[PDB]
Design a protein around this ligand. Structure first.
Ligand SMILES: CO[C@H]1O[C@H](CO)[C@@H](O)[C@H](O)[C@H]1NC(C)=O
Ligand SMILES: [Ca+2]
Length: 122
């Protein structure tokens, strides 16, 4: 699968659901990061674009209470790269996952209605 960053204007950021709909409209989905190689591919997209210091929606979304986090594309949640202390469901409203687009490439759970950049896979 091919990944593509979407870090548009400051008023072009999207909720998790709007970002998923955008990627699905292209025939793909929000990106799942399934291993270190896919993580490095995305990091290199960030360096190539110069889109540093940005947060991006990934396909991480909470399933049932039993399952916890899932990938929107159905991939197994095997590889994980949560930031230390995450996921923390801060204030009980954080059911989607974002990438901090810095060298750590770490994940954080946040409120799905937050406006973020996003990464598609196609
Ligand atoms: C203060 O909360 C923020 O930072 C913590 C980690 O310190 C994060 O866990 C938390 O998700 C994040 N919330 C938002 C809206 O970005
Ligand atoms: Ca969090």
């Amino acid at each position: 699968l091919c990944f593509k960053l979407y870090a548009k204007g400051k008023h072009e950021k999207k909720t998790w659901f709007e970002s998923r709909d955008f990627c699905r409209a292209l025939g793909g989905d929000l990106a799942s990061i399934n291993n270190k190689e896919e993580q490095q591919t995305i990091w290199r997209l960030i360096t190539a674009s110069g889109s540093y210091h940005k947060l991006f929606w990934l396909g991480l979304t909470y399933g049932s209470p039993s399952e916890g986090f899932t990938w929107s594309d159905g991939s197994p949640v095997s590889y994980e790269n949560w930031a230390y202390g995450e996921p923390n469901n801060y204030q009980n409203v954080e059911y989607c996952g974002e990438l901090k687009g810095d060298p750590t490439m770490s994940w954080n759970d946040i409120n799905c209605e937050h406006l973020n950049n996003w990464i598609c896979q196609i």
